Scaffold this motif. Sequence first.
Motif, PDB file in Angstrom:
ATOM      1  N   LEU A 160      46.206  37.301  45.932  1.00  0.00           N
ATOM      2  CA  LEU A 160      45.244  38.395  45.859  1.00  0.00           C
ATOM      3  C   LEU A 160      43.810  37.884  45.918  1.00  0.00           C
ATOM      4  CD1 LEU A 160      44.546  41.513  44.924  1.00  0.00           C
ATOM      5  CD2 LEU A 160      44.247  40.348  42.729  1.00  0.00           C
ATOM      6  N   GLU A 161      43.514  36.796  45.202  1.00  0.00           N
ATOM      7  CA  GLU A 161      42.152  36.273  45.194  1.00  0.00           C
ATOM      8  C   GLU A 161      41.720  35.817  46.580  1.00  0.00           C
ATOM      9  OE1 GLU A 161      41.128  36.710  40.993  1.00  0.00           O
ATOM     10  OE2 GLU A 161      39.978  36.333  42.822  1.00  0.00           O
TER      11      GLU A 161
ATOM     12  N   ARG B 250      44.075  48.773  42.597  1.00  0.00           N
ATOM     13  CA  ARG B 250      42.894  47.937  42.761  1.00  0.00           C
ATOM     14  C   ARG B 250      42.960  46.711  41.858  1.00  0.00           C
ATOM     15  NH1 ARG B 250      37.203  50.689  42.465  1.00  0.00           N
ATOM     16  NH2 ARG B 250      36.654  48.771  43.598  1.00  0.00           N
ATOM     17  N   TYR B 251      42.260  45.663  42.276  1.00  0.00           N
ATOM     18  CA  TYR B 251      42.091  44.423  41.498  1.00  0.00           C
ATOM     19  C   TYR B 251      43.477  43.802  41.288  1.00  0.00           C
ATOM     20  CZ  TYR B 251      37.497  46.549  41.055  1.00  0.00           C
ATOM     21  OH  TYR B 251      36.273  47.125  41.321  1.00  0.00           O
ATOM     22  N   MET B 252      43.750  43.206  40.129  1.00  0.00           N
ATOM     23  CA  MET B 252      44.994  42.481  39.899  1.00  0.00           C
ATOM     24  C   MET B 252      46.000  43.382  39.196  1.00  0.00           C
ATOM     25  SD  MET B 252      47.038  40.105  40.204  1.00  0.00           S
ATOM     26  CE  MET B 252      48.465  39.321  39.455  1.00  0.00           C
TER      27      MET B 252
ATOM     28  N   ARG C 211      36.626  42.124  54.354  1.00  0.00           N
ATOM     29  CA  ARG C 211      37.853  41.364  54.146  1.00  0.00           C
ATOM     30  C   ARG C 211      38.784  41.473  55.347  1.00  0.00           C
ATOM     31  NH1 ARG C 211      37.776  44.228  48.211  1.00  0.00           N
ATOM     32  NH2 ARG C 211      36.981  42.433  47.019  1.00  0.00           N
TER      33      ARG C 211
ATOM     34  N   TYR D  45      31.498  45.576  52.021  1.00  0.00           N
ATOM     35  CA  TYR D  45      32.140  44.380  51.485  1.00  0.00           C
ATOM     36  C   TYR D  45      33.654  44.472  51.613  1.00  0.00           C
ATOM     37  CZ  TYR D  45      27.935  42.305  49.397  1.00  0.00           C
ATOM     38  OH  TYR D  45      26.712  41.709  49.187  1.00  0.00           O
ATOM     39  N   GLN D  46      34.221  45.641  51.306  1.00  0.00           N
ATOM     40  CA  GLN D  46      35.667  45.817  51.395  1.00  0.00           C
ATOM     41  C   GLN D  46      36.149  45.654  52.830  1.00  0.00           C
ATOM     42  OE1 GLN D  46      36.183  49.621  49.561  1.00  0.00           O
ATOM     43  NE2 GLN D  46      36.251  48.791  47.476  1.00  0.00           N
TER      44      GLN D  46
ATOM     45  N   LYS E  18      41.005  39.047  48.785  1.00  0.00           N
ATOM     46  CA  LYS E  18      39.801  39.769  48.397  1.00  0.00           C
ATOM     47  C   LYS E  18      38.529  38.944  48.566  1.00  0.00           C
ATOM     48  CE  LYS E  18      42.313  43.214  47.391  1.00  0.00           C
ATOM     49  NZ  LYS E  18      42.305  44.378  48.320  1.00  0.00           N
ATOM     50  N   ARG E  19      38.650  37.664  48.904  1.00  0.00           N
ATOM     51  CA  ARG E  19      37.506  36.776  49.058  1.00  0.00           C
ATOM     52  C   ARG E  19      37.153  36.651  50.534  1.00  0.00           C
ATOM     53  NH1 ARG E  19      37.788  30.321  47.385  1.00  0.00           N
ATOM     54  NH2 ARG E  19      36.015  29.589  48.642  1.00  0.00           N
ATOM     55  N   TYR E  20      35.864  36.799  50.852  1.00  0.00           N
ATOM     56  CA  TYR E  20      35.407  36.658  52.227  1.00  0.00           C
ATOM     57  C   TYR E  20      33.938  36.280  52.223  1.00  0.00           C
ATOM     58  CZ  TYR E  20      34.753  37.481  57.212  1.00  0.00           C
ATOM     59  OH  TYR E  20      34.483  37.328  58.553  1.00  0.00           O
ATOM     60  N   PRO E  21      33.503  35.336  53.076  1.00  0.00           N
ATOM     61  CA  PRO E  21      34.331  34.549  54.004  1.00  0.00           C
ATOM     62  C   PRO E  21      35.238  33.536  53.303  1.00  0.00           C
ATOM     63  CG  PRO E  21      32.044  34.638  54.737  1.00  0.00           C
ATOM     64  CD  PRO E  21      32.066  35.129  53.324  1.00  0.00           C
TER      65      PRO E  21
ATOM     66  N   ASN F 280      50.697  38.882  43.776  1.00  0.00           N
ATOM     67  CA  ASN F 280      50.558  37.483  43.396  1.00  0.00           C
ATOM     68  C   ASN F 280      49.076  37.198  43.204  1.00  0.00           C
ATOM     69  OD1 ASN F 280      50.098  34.439  44.113  1.00  0.00           O
ATOM     70  ND2 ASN F 280      52.279  34.592  43.605  1.00  0.00           N
ATOM     71  N   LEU F 281      48.734  36.559  42.082  1.00  0.00           N
ATOM     72  CA  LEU F 281      47.328  36.416  41.711  1.00  0.00           C
ATOM     73  C   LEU F 281      46.561  35.586  42.734  1.00  0.00           C
ATOM     74  CD1 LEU F 281      45.017  36.745  39.525  1.00  0.00           C
ATOM     75  CD2 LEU F 281      45.801  34.522  38.672  1.00  0.00           C
ATOM     76  N   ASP F 282      47.085  34.409  43.084  1.00  0.00           N
ATOM     77  CA  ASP F 282      46.372  33.543  44.016  1.00  0.00           C
ATOM     78  C   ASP F 282      46.393  34.100  45.435  1.00  0.00           C
ATOM     79  OD1 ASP F 282      45.578  31.826  42.056  1.00  0.00           O
ATOM     80  OD2 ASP F 282      46.605  30.058  42.855  1.00  0.00           O
TER      81      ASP F 282
END
Lengths: 509, 513, 515, 509
Positions: free
Chosen positions: D499-500, D488-490, D178, D174-175, D503-506, D495-497
Amino acid sequence: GKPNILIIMVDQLNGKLFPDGPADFLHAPNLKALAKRSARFHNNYTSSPLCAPARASFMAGQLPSRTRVYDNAAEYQSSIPTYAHHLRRAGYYTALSGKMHFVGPDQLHGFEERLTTDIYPADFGWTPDYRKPGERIDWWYHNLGSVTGAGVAEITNQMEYDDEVAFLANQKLYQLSRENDDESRRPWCLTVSFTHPHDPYVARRKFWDLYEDCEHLTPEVGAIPLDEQDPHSQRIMLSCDYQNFDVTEENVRRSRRAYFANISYLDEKVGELIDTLTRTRMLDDTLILFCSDHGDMLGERGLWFKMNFFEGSARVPLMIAGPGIAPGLHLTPTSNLDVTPTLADLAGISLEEVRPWTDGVSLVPMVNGVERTEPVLMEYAAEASYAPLVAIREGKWKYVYCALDPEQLFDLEADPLELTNLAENPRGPVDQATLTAFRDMRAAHWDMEAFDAAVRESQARRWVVYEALRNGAYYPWDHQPLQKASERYMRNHMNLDTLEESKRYPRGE
Amino acid sequence: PVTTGKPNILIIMVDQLNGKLFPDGPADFLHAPNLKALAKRSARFHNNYTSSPLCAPARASFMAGQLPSRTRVYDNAAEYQSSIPTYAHHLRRAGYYTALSGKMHFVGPDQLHGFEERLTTDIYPADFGWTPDYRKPGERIDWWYHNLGSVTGAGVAEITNQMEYDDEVAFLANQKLYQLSRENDDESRRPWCLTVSFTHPHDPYVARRKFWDLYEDCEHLTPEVGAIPLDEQDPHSQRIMLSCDYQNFDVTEENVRRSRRAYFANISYLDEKVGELIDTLTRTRMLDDTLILFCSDHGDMLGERGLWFKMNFFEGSARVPLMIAGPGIAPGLHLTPTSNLDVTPTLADLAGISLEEVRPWTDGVSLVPMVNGVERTEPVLMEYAAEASYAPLVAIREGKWKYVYCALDPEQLFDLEADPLELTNLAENPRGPVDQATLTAFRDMRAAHWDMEAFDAAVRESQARRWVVYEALRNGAYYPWDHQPLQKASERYMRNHMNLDTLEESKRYPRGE
Amino acid sequence: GDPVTTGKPNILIIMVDQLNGKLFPDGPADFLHAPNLKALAKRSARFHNNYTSSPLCAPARASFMAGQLPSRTRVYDNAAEYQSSIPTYAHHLRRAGYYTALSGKMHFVGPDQLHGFEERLTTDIYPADFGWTPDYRKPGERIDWWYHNLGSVTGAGVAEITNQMEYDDEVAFLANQKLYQLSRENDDESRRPWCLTVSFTHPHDPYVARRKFWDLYEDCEHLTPEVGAIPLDEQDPHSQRIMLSCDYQNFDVTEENVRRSRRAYFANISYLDEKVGELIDTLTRTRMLDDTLILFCSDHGDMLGERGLWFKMNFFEGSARVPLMIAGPGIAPGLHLTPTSNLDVTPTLADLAGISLEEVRPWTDGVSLVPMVNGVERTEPVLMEYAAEASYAPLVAIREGKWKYVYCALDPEQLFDLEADPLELTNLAENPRGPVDQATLTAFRDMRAAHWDMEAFDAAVRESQARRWVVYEALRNGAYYPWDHQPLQKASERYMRNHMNLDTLEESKRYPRGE
Amino acid sequence: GKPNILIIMVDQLNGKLFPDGPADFLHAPNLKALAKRSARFHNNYTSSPLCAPARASFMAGQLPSRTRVYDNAAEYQSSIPTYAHHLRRAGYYTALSGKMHFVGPDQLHGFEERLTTDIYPADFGWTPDYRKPGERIDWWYHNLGSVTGAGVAEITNQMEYDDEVAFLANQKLYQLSRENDDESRRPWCLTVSFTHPHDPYVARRKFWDLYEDCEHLTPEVGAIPLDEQDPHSQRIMLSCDYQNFDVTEENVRRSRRAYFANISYLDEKVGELIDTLTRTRMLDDTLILFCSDHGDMLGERGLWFKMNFFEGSARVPLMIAGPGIAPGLHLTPTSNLDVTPTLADLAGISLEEVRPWTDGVSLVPMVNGVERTEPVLMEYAAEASYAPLVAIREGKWKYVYCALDPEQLFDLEADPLELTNLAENPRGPVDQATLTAFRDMRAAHWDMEAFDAAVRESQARRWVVYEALRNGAYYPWDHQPLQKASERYMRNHMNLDTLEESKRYPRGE
Ligand SMILES: [Ca+2]
Ligand SMILES: [Ca+2]
């Protein structure tokens, strides 16, 4: 009734400056006082004129051809037993504070505890390539900038290191003093390995001022021109980038001066350890050894640093003091290979348990007047060498062989500064008879063609691996010392009054 | 925003140093040459006081410049919250590199409190173990309370838990200065502020033979005021005496002399460590641009009035040295009472930080005006709400007076000019109508500054809160809060991602010589 | 010595973030694909009207852990320091002899990332420093790099991996592995009872789910909020502050954006439900299910497009109500309608765990729900607070009987009759129906003034914000020291090492044994 | 354009259970579906029938005599290149999730990242001793308690391991998904190495119930009494303490049932990895390899586990699927030594760069229909052996040699169940020409006394070091994986948006 052992080790100490203890012109009161207590070995030699090969050889008491540590980037196997293993197996607490130049993921090699990291890398970066002879790698090779850049500074990379090594060693001696009075104690063996007087030749003003009146700032043998140099010395000059350095006479004196100053800088640190041993009431039951991995030509013959078998590069001091050691000067040539069997002998370890794991001999019989007959062997297979070099040191002779070089033979009683090659210009039928005897000894000890093949395989193997290990995220092998802070000083799972007495020594005074 | 020109700051701190031993720099009988030489360079404050005569409360107060009633750090195990700004925060926010080597007695998961780097762990625990309990007055907890075993057990040793600590506090501090010296010829350099906090001369009174020999011909081995019997002691002193378990100890006269002798010797043991720092600063060519402060968190009675250690407002336990030297500081002696609360706003002032950004976060005042001959009139306030106390004690130091209040004790007022050794309680035996008017003025002052009932309530809540929490945390697997310093070895010395020639030049200072 | 723990049950707390409690009327709603949570609901005491303490991650969770209101925990926002000395239910249980463990999110801000927990299995998904600190001195401003914005609504969709999904998959796995590890201690009668908290981040936005669960709601009808978007001119002052704090001016939220957001939200509930069944099955197969109390709860809710609002930060039902279910031994199933609060979880856990209520009363602002489970009537009201973003002064709320009273010094009061107005569309404070509404309003004003000094509240929040902005500015100069939790299972003490016995090792790590 | 590579590995998978994919009676639907896609090697063999020597050989593509990893405690030196090194050098991100039994301080061996620690020790504890033949070591030797202790459990030490191995592998996939929309993406090679179906034979009830109607719970060869067994099988029986175990037929049936159940337990984990690759849209660009270190006799001939060259212990599955691979069956004997050169070949690496570092050959030509002629070599020098044993597998023959044992020759076409030793009972004039040819091949490839000397030196070297390392404070070499939570994570340095979205795929869906 087993004694403690304190091994004081410096890097790149020209053994000729220790004729019978430190030389008279050296301002080293503590090492001088230790010499009067110790059995001194005037003609002690390294196993390989380099940091990593000598130290891996020093630890295991095995030649570089057996330890496989051929250069500054060859991996040291975890399975190779060292004197740390032997003493630890006999019940000793073993500790290393300082430098041993372990290459590979193992950074203890038998040591139960290591107090500092190493000043030098632990990866396969400094790997020579026999395949490409004449090539030099500027970002880690030695160059004569150490001589033109010699001077005075209050902090250096090496002095920050040695200040740390010296303090943590004295801290461990204080800590071990708390375990005295307890007679279920484990005898400790602490190794204090300093990096000085390795180059850069820079010292602190306090010690640099001690050698304002010095006259030994000129080498005994001047700069031999390149075309009059032996092939191996030429290669050393090639690897030092002599063509891009104009080393003046002052550059030679300043480099020798800071070198001598850094020796005094070390003698102050030796006095700290002796003082700590004395006030902690551990001095009488502690053996003290002084040693070094290799020497420094210090401008003699025009050469600097190491990487050869000449007296300045190959000879290192060796002194053993402590209970049961009769002081005196010894002239029969010794080797660093003999430190590990000598250490086990002094520790009561039987000779049958050390015989199959070391190539040297115990020096305790020599201390007590027994004659030693084993020759001294030396090897080198790193930079400035295009094929392995071997050397034999017996009686008054030194024999040097290389498959690409004319052999060297030196009568060190009649030629202390080795200027007359007896293999090229023999004096009589005895010189030619000696040369033939050393050729038979060398062929009986060394398969120079298998030596070269083993070194080439080690180089080609580590390269492919190192190019891979240097892609992506790097995983360092540098030793990270950890004193658990959650278990030091006062923590609320103990008792304050019980802790204060246990951390205090001497007690009841 | 200006960046260059700001001075370096070296804060040399010691633990449990009787301020009376520093009347105008170190006392003459003390063999402290380096501190005597630093004194004549510095603005010395003769009448400097702690904020709270206890290690952890004075230290959380010293860091933030706030009273223990504001820091909520009431005792030796109260949590010091991360959000409280300290002088490390103020200087770091102003562009300083902040480093700590030594003891600050932080209790809680935060062992930095603004410090960018901390070189050693703490000598004392960081959990809620040493928490007193006001619900049980008269109790004593043997495994961490003070006891007179330090006086009967004083002597000579070559290594102790404290000497091991201070030896590596000193070395790591000098190593950091050597490291910081490599940044000296850089114009874009960050100014550094390094605090060297030693544990000596805190008890045990055990010193090395070398320093113990320096005080063989000493005459100050007997306290100026002998042991006052328990029947004649004030209520708070008796409480300190019972919390020390003096009944199970026969303190000989030689016990006092040995304790004081090792105490003075460990002052000389510290003075030699002061000269190392000064010599490191001088040879690294950083001395002229470095302000140097010498301070302490609380004092030690040293047998005066029969009392030992601290936890009271008497001069020996409440007074501490305070000296500031360096660029822009005129040397001199000052007699107006000062407080450890003043260090934080003074540090920010000396470092160019506007005091408008520091005043909402400190209870003290900057001493920089006083250095330049400006009159200071703010009083000196002191608190205590820990062991040997069953209710909070507060003290006021103003002019020649010292007023001590406790809801369970008779009041105290001393005229330190007419009565340096505090033997006449002017609250109980006034000399005239002035003493009676002075006692009334301080009552109005104390009431204006303290709600002594809410003070006792907040301390009781902080103790009970911690007793439930420390109960659980000591069950199962323990998670320690002790600071673990980490100098990553994979980035020190020679590593094969650098150049050997470039590294040697960068790690060398001075260069070109 | 060791506390007596014989006969004490295990406790498994399953937690989620941003779960609208209105989606759990009597357990999970019918339209939701949630077989495992529905099966747990028929086993459990279900609290239909349970409320959060503060509509936001960090303030609700510090309150949830300790059972104290944010005004008592001082954790006002997502960056306020949670003091190490504040006792939580981890402390209370661990004191009584429980092994306590947390796998997942709790949004601890400060150097303490355990807060009584003996072991934490994961790091936190959200920061642990003072970065997200609001400032009452600058009302109307918003901080783009961490504030909520309507991009979650316009960007809702399908993905196989996200930041949250990597987290919750790691949370769910380590939770089941810990249950497996504890099952080896299960035939030892001198064992400690365990309390494992499993806290998932879903269904917190972003509204992004996997294809497997997104396809479950192809035929869904609840994709449209019950109350449509209220225009900004017709919104209450607080809702207007939430809208501008969400940057609604630069987002064209279409109706399709609303349906995709709710669909992925519902899909992520089914995503969580499959993880619930994994835990239940692990308990069942390890033979620990019958001695284990199971609690389902959330920190706060989500408006999900109702009234045009999204996310939380308000006292409306969709944002303030969260589910609360308690199953296990000794718990009589049933639905309860008396309003309850997340403040009650901590005293309830201590009551279920045989801890005397005299040792928890001085540390909690809530009451035990155990009597209510056994039919005893509860009369204490539900109190709520908010002092973070989209607010310029603290807001408070009282929930008692059928009323909800919301007060803010800068706002008109709000009073709703939730029996006659479940979708709170009539402000009885502004338009009273009769003399009873006026009397009830006055009764709540006296209740409020007796519980809150809104002036001291606003001063404490302002002190907490300004104190942190000084410290955080300094802490972000030079080398940063992070406070994030670093879990560590020492590899030198796991599996087969050469200081144990191989055959003794296998038998100790095997469970059940002898089969 | 370089493909991804997923290497799924298991320990002690009997190769005979994988003739053309999984056997029909095994409930392995995911591995059968993968078999239909992959090139299947019916006669693939291990390099050494033991955990650590096989995997050390598997990683480097070199025989145990070349890697010097003779037993489960021999040091695997860091300078030996593995396929991780070769791929990492070629620009690959290399990761290992699971077990490889690295002995020594190096637990990576070219792997840029390792996700789990190893299930087995990494020191020199399990060191055999040729000096004391016939004496076992109770606390780590194999015993038949695994057969008498087979059963059902919901958690084991191995299942806790493999559950962690399988999850962290799916998380890494999964990682890496991305990074899947960058053209500058590094190709990844993730090795998922499970410990199942290694003994203890204990399975979860869900999989144990799948094999109630099974008719393969009885071995094809019954137990051969001790007097009728070959000398090596006799030492294996003694090294397993067979005299202290009464093994019921039900003990045999329950062991095979739990073994087969754990194969289905592994097949579900295989389906997880495939599902992750499919949904993350990396399946088409990923090569998938199924393989194993050695096999398990599973009661056949009365033997269990490994340590021998019989088909049940020496044969392992080998399947290669993915882009550019033609599915099909292959019968010419292959070796695990071929995996490392096969991996480099599929990764575009030139053959001249891996030629001097591997003893095997690339199977890519064989996949495309080219005939392979190289024989398959096997060695063993660990427990239940008092001297090294070698083996040759060519065509239809298997020759086994040991200086202390009568030779063995098997015609595996006429005698798949090796019951007729053709070296002792020849059939015709070819069977003795064939034995003479294998004697010439064996003498040309192996110095059996130098082999015995090297193994003995390694054993005596480690016994000295391990005895010392086990005194005082112990320094563990076990791998400690660490994903730094501060990154890792936030975290508030991002920047939060932003970062999201990263980390999101697809994305965009
Ligand atoms: Ca050297
Ligand atoms: Ca939340």
